[PDB]
């Protein structure tokens, strides 16, 4: 609805990430999310981004 970027998490205990302006790559956002979800660096390799409305996974 409202303009902007909203990266959601399946854990309701964590606030969804918000962005307003800038240029970013997928890996940077993945790292930022992993910091919020307290994922160890050894296991962040298994995670990525996905879009429900388009059924497409972003490249790294």
UniProtKB/TrEMBL annotation:
Localization recorded for this chain is: Endomembrane system
Indicate the family of this protein: Belongs to the protein kinase superfamily. Tyr protein kinase family. JAK subfamily.
Functionally, this protein is described as follows: Tyrosine kinase of the non-receptor type, involved in the IFN-alpha/beta/gamma signal pathway. Kinase partner for the interleukin (IL)-2 receptor as well as interleukin (IL)-10 receptor. Kinase partner for the type I interferon receptor IFNAR2. In response to interferon-binding to IFNAR1-IFNAR2 heterodimer, phosphorylates and activates its binding partner IFNAR2, creating docking sites for STAT proteins. Directly phosphorylates STAT proteins but also activates STAT signaling through the transactivation of other JAK kinases associated with signaling receptors.
Record protein name field: Tyrosine-protein kinase
Q: Which gene encodes it?
A: Jak1
Whole sequence portion shown: 32 to 91 of 1153
